[PDB]
Symmetry: C2
Subunit: 62 residues, 2 copies
Amino acid sequence: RICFNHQSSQPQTTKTCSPGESSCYNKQWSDFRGTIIERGCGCPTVKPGIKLSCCESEVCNN
Amino acid sequence: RICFNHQSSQPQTTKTCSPGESSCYNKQWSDFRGTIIERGCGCPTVKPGIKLSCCESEVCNN
């Protein structure tokens, strides 16, 4: 699996996940400065108030 | 949990999920009509090739 791993609106970047990993994630929240987007491989545990989306296809998390 | 449940490009509609349900899903494939999107509560398994995204926040599955 290949997932995007770039932050917010930064130029797209990707990363090769570990073998067996089928998911990518999109973690969104707003801090004092508004919306922030984090992306990567897997489907991590997230804090309350954090919007988490997990998808199962190549670079599905933009 | 509230999730969208409208198909493809129809007007947005929502559904209140069963208690105990915290996920919403977006399932996408294609047919003669174009890109088909199914939305709902939960996080189903899909046939290989079908794009699936699951999210854990209100109306997160547009």
